[PDB]
Amino acid sequence: TQLDEKQHIVINNGAEPQSFDPHKTEGVPESNVAYQLLEGLVTSDSEGKLQPGAAESWENTPDFKTWTFHLRKDAKWSNGDPVTAHDFVFAWRRLVDPATAAPYASYLSYLQVENAQDIIDGKKKPAELGVEAKDDYTFVVHATNPVPYAVSLTTHQSLLPLPQKVVEKLGDAWVKKENYVGNGAYKLANHIINEKIEFERNPLYWNDKETVINSATFLAIENPSTDVARYRAGDLDMTSYGLPPEQFAKLKKELLGEVYVTRTLGTYSYELNNKKAPFDNVNIRKALNLSLDRNVITDKVLGQGQTPTYVFTPTYIEEGHLIQQPAYSKEPMAQRNEEAIKLLEEAGYSKANPLKFSILYNTNENHKKVAIAAASMWKANTKGLIDVKLENQEWKTYIDSRRAGRYDVARAGWHADYNQATTFGNYFLSNSSNNTAKYANPEYDKAMAESYAATDAEGRAKAYAKAEEILGKDYGIVPIFNYVNPRLVKPYVKGYSGKDPQDHIYLRNLYIIKH
Numbered sequence: 312t313q314l315d316e317k318q319h320i321v322i323n324n325g326a327e328p329q330s331f332d333p334h335k336t337e338g339v340p341e342s343n344v345a346y347q348l349l350e351g352l353v354t355s356d357s358e359g360k361l362q363p364g365a366a367e368s369w370e371n372t373p374d375f376k377t378w379t380f381h382l383r384k385d386a387k388w389s390n391g392d393p394v395t396a397h398d399f400v401f402a403w404r405r406l407v408d409p410a411t412a413a414p415y416a417s418y419l420s421y422l423q424v425e426n427a428q429d430i431i432d433g434k435k436k437p438a439e440l441g442v443e444a445k446d447d448y449t450f451v452v453h454a455t456n457p458v459p460y461a462v463s464l465t466t467h468q469s470l471l472p473l474p475q476k477v478v479e480k481l482g483d484a485w486v487k488k489e490n491y492v493g494n495g496a497y498k499l500a501n502h503i504i505n506e507k508i509e510f511e512r513n514p515l516y517w518n519d520k521e522t523v524i525n526s527a528t529f530l531a532i533e534n535p536s537t538d539v540a541r542y543r544a545g546d547l548d549m550t551s552y553g554l555p556p557e558q559f560a561k562l563k564k565e566l567l568g569e570v571y572v573t574r575t576l577g578t579y580s581y582e583l584n585n586k587k588a589p590f591d592n593v594n595i596r597k598a599l600n601l602s603l604d605r606n607v608i609t610d611k612v613l614g615q616g617q618t619p620t621y622v623f624t625p626t627y628i629e630e631g632h633l634i635q636q637p638a639y640s641k642e643p644m645a646q647r648n649e650e651a652i653k654l655l656e657e658a659g660y661s662k663a664n665p666l667k668f669s670i671l672y673n674t675n676e677n678h679k680k681v682a683i684a685a686a687s688m689w690k691a692n693t694k695g696l697i698d699v700k701l702e703n704q705e706w707k708t709y710i711d712s713r714r715a716g717r718y719d720v721a722r723a724g725w726h727a728d729y730n731q732a733t734t735f736g737n738y739f740l741s742n743s744s745n746n747t748a749k750y751a752n753p754e755y756d757k758a759m760a761e762s763y764a765a766t767d768a769e770g771r772a773k774a775y776a777k778a779e780e781i782l783g784k785d786y787g788i789v790p791i792f793n794y795v796n797p798r799l800v801k802p803y804v805k806g807y808s809g810k811d812p813q814d815h816i817y818l819r820n821l822y823i824i825k826h
Contacts, residue, residue: 312826314523320804320821323538324529325551326673326706327505332486333468334406337414337745338710339726342468344529347510347818348493349471352380352399352450353462357820359730359811361462365394365472365494365517366450375457382448386517388474390492396444401475404430404437414714415469417744418728421737422464423454423763431744456763460629463729496522496819505531510818523822533706534676542799549804552796552814553677556613562799569799571809572616576625576727577794578735579617581670581685581720582713585787586749589666590719594654596786599720602651602692603685604644609792612684613677616795622779623725624735625793630768631732633776637783648692655696662695669700672722673709681791682722713747721747724794727813732775733762739782750787 328341333349336342354364366380386394405411407419407430419427425441441453454461464470474492478485485491488499496519497510508529512522532538535553539562542550554562554570563570583590583599590596605619621640624631639647660666670686672678679701686699699720704712713721727734736759737743741751755778762774782788796814800807806821 312824315803315823315825318523318525318823319527320524320549320818320823321528321530321547322549322816323532323541323547323551324508325531325538325553325675326533327531328508329707329710330486331491331499332483333471333473334402334411334413334415336468336710338706340531340706343816344508345468345471346495346815347497347527348491348495348499348513349473350495350516351467351471352465354817355466355811355813355815357806357808357811359813359815361466364466365399369462371459371461375459375461376454378452378454378461379445380450380452382450383517384448386494387515388477388492388494389498389513389515390474390477391515392474392476392492393447394472394494395447396450397447398472398475399450400442400444401478402473403442403470404440405473405478406469407431407440408437409433413469414744415467417737417740417742418464418467418469420743421733422452422461423456423458425453425455428742432742457766460729460731463731467728496817497527500526507531516819518819522819524818527818533674536676539799542801548801549807549816550799552794552798553675554615554797554799555677556615556680559615559797566799568802571796571798571800571807573796573798573809573811573814574616574627575794575796575814576628576730576734576812577796578620578623578625578725579681579791579794580623580723580725581789581791582723582748583720583786583788584716584718584749585751587716587719589658592658593786595658595666598651598654598658598693599689599697600786600789601639601647601654602689602697603789603791604688604692605640605791607688608681608684612680613792615797617792620790620793622783623739623788623790624732624775624779625727627793628727628735629731630772630775633772634732634779635776644692652693652696655693660696665696665698667698667700668719669702670720670722671702671704671709671712671718673706674703678722679703716747716749720789723747723788726794730812732772733759736762736775736778739778739787748788750782750785752781752785752787755781755785 326340333345350364352366368381429435477492496516498513500511501509510527538550609617626634670682689697758778765771
């Protein structure tokens with residue numbers, strides 16, 4: 312039973328992306344697009360395992376501080392310019408240049424690249440970053456501490472190279488469909504805002520000979536019910552990674568074989584704005600954590616396999632085993648609620664004068680459902696001391712508000728950028744460009760800093776447990792659950808495994824079968 316003649320595929324990408332410039336974004340819809348059009352030093356297969364990308368080989372010194380990548384001598388951007396180490400140097404410098412204002416600027420600081428933090432903090436020029444083109448096809452990364460998991464970091468959207476010649480000549484107009492040049496398996500055929508992105512084969516991709524899918528469309532359907540309806544109508548082949556909890560038990564039995572649920576390294580949270588009154592009060596942040604019943608959300612609201620959590624890092628992640636769930640999470644709800652009430656009353660709330668705020672979330676009926684549940688539990692568990700409004704915003708507008716800090720409480724999902732605990736731990740550093748909570752605690756920073764010169768797993772895992780303990784005591788955010796990624800995938804679509812813990816979809820890993 313063979314390959315189809317056609318090889319077209321339609322996939323829900325869930326929202327209109329903020330941008331196709333991998334230095335201007337931090338979201339999953341954006342990265343999904345970037346990963347089709349560009350390819351970093353290394354990439355991954357259907358199960359998250361690492362394989363050669365722009366680098367055909369690489370090595371490290373025994374101290375894990377020097378990483379040397381050998382680029383393909385004949386590889387070309389999609390316009391035919393050579394892909395060189397200079398492109399990687401150019402791009403990684405741009406990531407950290409403060410003038411670029413990248414949300415992921417801090418990513419190279421996570422990798423411990425020499426001078427990355429100082430460049431971000433404005434103390435050194437971008438050109439002083441500890442990466443170099445030793446020649447045109449040798450890119451070398453120099454780190455100040457050992458980073459044995461460094462190769463796996465290089466897969467991230469923020470470390471994608473850019474076509475220097477083009478970006479320098481065209482400025483940020485480079486991102487327009489008419490000018491976009493890239494080195495991934497696909498190239499932009501069309502972009503209609505709030506409707507579709509169309510991809511076509513990049514025949515100058517080094518590995519075009521292995522790409523099967525010829526064209527693809529990304530839809531931007533925000534609501535999972537609409538997603539499922541289109542799928543059933545046969546107008547899309549894979550949903551995005553949310554499904555209606557109402558239809559879910561049915562879909563599983565009726566579309567047996569088509570329902571995938573990947574266990575992913577992700578945490579769903581309500582992020583509290585730690586520098587806006589009244590969430591700058593730890594007592595109030597503690598009350599909210601105490602009075603929210605996680606099992607209500609994972610069991611009655613969703614019921615898809617999501618598991619309740621009271622910490623940020625998924626504990627099943629590599630080197631997360633020592634992370635402990637906090638003690639309040641084991642007390643009866645009635646005792647937790649009594650304590651919450653006490654705290655809110657001590658802070659001057661009553662039924663007549665309750666704690667009023669809004670939950671900001673991106674338009675999406677599953678998030679709305681969780682927001683209603685949370686608002687509901689918060690009013691009732693505190694006997695009227697909390698009163699929550701809901702503020703849905705479009706994806707781009709929601710991302711913009713979180714980043715500008717124009718919010719009280721915001722829905723937040725963090726998905727691992729690499730399968731090692733620090734991809735979470737690093738989020739909450741005072742100076743992390745990713746930290747839209749504005750959580751800042753010198754002792755957290757110190758705990759994470761001292762993980763970075765531990766020379767075995769155990770030592771690192773202890774630091775992460777301490778960091779997670781400090782963030783927990785500060786009640787910096789409201790963690791809720793660890794993700795499963797429920798998706799519907801047509802039976803004629805192959806190459807999607809359901810075993811990738813970052814649940815990436817690379818069009819080059821798929822193919823359509825006949826019969």
